[PDB]
Design a protein around this ligand. Structure first.
Ligand SMILES: O=C(O)CCC(=O)C(=O)O
Lengths: 417, 415
């Protein structure tokens, strides 16, 4: 596994820019401000289902102060250990320069993901993903001058055959040859895709993996909705089948723990992670120290039992919420729209039947009646193409809210037929 | 005035990526914030009302918020900025550079997003060495030609800036193929590592040249509130009649380094490329941490903020007082150095040793003493450096006494 092909000229040229022997030791060498100057002295944070979190005066100075680039070591060790327990990556005991598994706490998981595109993509590069695809990722990949090659997805995500067919534009030996512009990577959201809410299967993941071996590209696994799986048996990740070190997982605490706190993490091979760490060192520097410590203490006080149980209560909430969105649709959309039932996440994806563009429907008529939901146009490389799709958030609304929401939508559709 | 020549093809192709009511909305992407474990917060402040988050606030604090900062924090920094600098640009048309500001994840987030926005490989850029190693290492992979401007007690020597530019004519600004300097990067207030600051006369002159030659000025000003002189030298932003100043500001030295929260002020179209890059990277600065800071600032008020920064300049001033005292004591005739004008560093040039790397990395450590060799603060970091960076931020008068006596001892052993 050669990593140089996946590291921009710029990315390779980064050197480490850190904040960075007898016994007592009198350092004037370092850069830290004096943390006594800072105004906040203590904190108490109450937790549902938990012991309150205390920052004593000493701990608060630590929270107000520069901390390491890759994250605090107690959160780093605990997430690594989570990743060993959840996924047991084939690579954890490999050599560093082969793909030893490494992890970086990042300022939300999209920070890591961006820095990963920037690391990989030369203009003119080819990338695989399936559409509909995440708004945020299209606005991300677009300025990078890559050519986005769409793989068909259905209710089970990426269709493997589509991937085969697409990749038969190249011989496998073309991977050893940059001129041939073989794909760099496949970007997938494998659990409750935003916007579609469909998830990848196990058999499918294994097959995708083999194609990724054969055509020696990286798999980018964006898995923000992995702890929002409604099925009890969690589907194995690409991470857990990564005997090569061709997988970069992104994990988020945003749907589960806190979206505000901007704390997520990036799991992958050392040399790749290292490029992101080094990019972080000249931009954000680290994730907020305060907030890492809220999460780290929270998580260590729960242990893995409290964490998983918490995630079981989130899932429980999000499913009933999903039962209610579907009831409501089964109630009003029947025979007027088509949808599959979300495998994870917080989004229902609704194909309205016999209307071409739902933008008018939504942005003109539906808003006038006081109901709103997201036109599907944004979720395609070509956002100007007509979409007959709505994305509907089942995250906040009460059963009655959805009832009126779908009573009104169905009316506007009937009125627009 | 023409910002397109200042913005990369990439930076430019970026697209923004974020009601009668009683409205029902189903197209939000917010997660249900009620699922979050953290319920209430209390934080204490020395000489301040206790900051409290009730269940509602807290919820907002654990939730996605705007890209460029919560609005009660943006207006307060936007205000502070009108008040500290009163930019001639405030009431400009937006497309003509109207002063804009986003909260960033610490000031170096903004400043990185700004190099990425500006720099094509091959471009020519100005700053003054020694320069902060971080900025060196940020710029290095961007593939610019770094052109060193001479500096002295007082920062960037502008005569040197004139002689450098004389290789072009003003007219070469409108001709991209001439490769005129894209921008001048500076740390106007005790530069890290020198601790030197620009004078107001020099800043004027620097501005004229930047006008003549149409280059941006990035004023990296993390030590703005750490100024030992009670009159604060006017900033490049207070004299940006053109819309060519990009200012970085930091709460890292005064408020918190750890909360990662700083701010970038500058022409709207330029800030706009930065906010759009933030939207697919960090999304925004921690909502929680902005709320902590915001409620601290509104409660202190403009006055009270300032009483604080005085409080810490006073602290930093005594520390550097203590550090100069000890240098005087042990280092006289063995070294030379200027009084830092601001910041937390002292920059000491040791006599008759060509490179200080052995002196520190072998001898000093062994004797339990540490200072930072200058090597790292120049483009060419393999070059001998007879200079030491020393931090007066934490050490006590006693620990500085022993640091220096020990350091002078070994300097005299190495002669
Ligand atoms: O529009 C926003 O503020 C945030 C959207 C987001 O990150 C999400 O898709 O969950």
């Amino acid at each position: 596994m050669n990593y140089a092909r996946f590291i921009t000229a710029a990315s390779a040229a980064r050197n480490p820019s850190p904040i960075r022997g007898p016994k007592s030791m009198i350092s004037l060498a370092g850069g830290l401000p004096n943390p006594n100057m800072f105004p906040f002295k203590t904190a108490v944070i109450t937790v549902e289902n938990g012991k309150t979190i205390q920052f004593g005066e000493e701990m608060m100075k630590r929270a107000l102060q520069y901390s390491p680039s890759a994250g605090i070591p107690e959160l780093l060790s605990w997430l690594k250990q989570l990743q060993i327990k959840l996924h047991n990556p084939p690579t954890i005991h490999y050599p560093p320069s082969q793909g030893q598994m490494d992890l970086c706490v990042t300022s939300g998981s999209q920070q890591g993901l961006c820095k990963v595109f920037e690391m990989i993509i030369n203009p003119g590069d080819n990338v695989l993903l399936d559409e509909p695809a995440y708004s945020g990722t299209l606005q991300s990949l677009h300025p990078l001058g890559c050519n986005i090659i769409n793989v068909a997805s259905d209710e089970s995500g990426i269709v493997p055959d589509s991937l085969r067919d697409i990749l038969s534009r190249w011989k496998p030996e073309d991977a050893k040859n940059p001129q041939k512009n073989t794909p760099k990577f496949l970007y997938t959201v494998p659990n409750g895709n935003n916007p579609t809410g469909n998830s990848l299967t196990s058999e499918r993941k294994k097959e995708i993996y083999e194609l990724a071996r054969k055509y020696d590209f990286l798999i980018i696994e964006d898995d923000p909705y992995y702890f929002l799986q409604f099925n009890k048996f969690r589907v194995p990740t690409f991470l857990s089948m990564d005997v090569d070190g061709r997988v970069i997982r992104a994990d988020s605490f945003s749907k589960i723990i806190s979206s505000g706190l901007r704390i997520g993490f990036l799991t992958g091979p050392k040399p790749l992670i290292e490029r992101v760490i080094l990019h972080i060192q000249v931009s954000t520097l680290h994730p907020s120290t305060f907030n890492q410590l809220m999460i780290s203490q929270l998580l260590h006080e729960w242990g893995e039992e409290g964490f998983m149980a918490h995630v079981d209560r989130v899932i429980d909430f999000y499913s009933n919420q999903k039962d209610a969105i579907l009831a409501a649709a089964d109630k009003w959309l029947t025979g007027l729209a088509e949808w599959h039932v979300p495998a994870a996440g917080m989004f229902l994806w609704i194909k309205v039947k016999g209307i071409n563009d739902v933008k008018e429907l939504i942005e003109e008529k539906a808003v006038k009646m006081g109901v709103l939901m997201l036109p599907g146009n944004a979720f395609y490389v070509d956002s100007s193409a007509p979409s007959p799709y709505l994305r509907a958030s089942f995250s906040s609304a009460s059963p009655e809210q959805m009832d009126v929401a779908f009573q009104v939508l169905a009316q506007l559709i009937k009125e627009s037929l």
